[PDB]
Write a protein that binds this ligand. Sequence first.
Ligand SMILES: CC[C@@H]1C=C[C@H]2CCN(C(=O)[C@@H]3CC[C@H]4C=C[C@]5(CCCN5C(=O)[C@H](Cc5ccccc5Cl)NC(C)=O)C(=O)N43)[C@@H]2C(=O)N1CC(=O)OC
Length: 110
Amino acid sequence: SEQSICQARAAVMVYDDANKKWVPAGGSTGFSRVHIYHHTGNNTFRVVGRKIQDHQVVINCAIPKGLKYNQATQTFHQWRDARQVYGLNFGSKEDANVFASAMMHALEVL
Ligand SMILES: CC[C@@H]1C=C[C@H]2CCN(C(=O)[C@@H]3CC[C@H]4C=C[C@]5(CCCN5C(=O)[C@H](Cc5ccccc5Cl)NC(C)=O)C(=O)N43)[C@@H]2C(=O)N1CC(=O)OC
């Protein structure tokens, strides 16, 4: 049972450490609709994004308590897990604000 707490437009990127380059998540350049989903049973939150064109899930990652969410610019935000670096290149500042708000809220209530 998952409730969407936000939707934002972004091109989801992951960092290729070996080549020191951002690459499109899922291998597919383009914009996705990126949700934060809240599972109320255990108060968990995940980032789940699907490409606008073909619906591919290109990101599905946990939001752990204590995450450092970096707002590098008004339209490019990023964070890390133990394996990967993620970046969201938002379609607008408004989308970056919506998503950052929801993320920051999740991080306050975890
Ligand atoms: C895809 C378009 C994109 C858009 C905008 C700009 C904004 C700046 N920018 C970057 O990639 C910035 C520039 C410096 C470089 C250096 C390192 C990187 C990459 C790896 C992670 N990182 C960290 O700075 C992390 C952050 C972090 C801090 C705290 C907590 C979590 C995290 Cl993740 N610092 C650690 C220590 O992990 C990084 O983001 N970098 C983006 C960018 O140029 N482009 C264009 C492009 O790539 O065209 C070729």
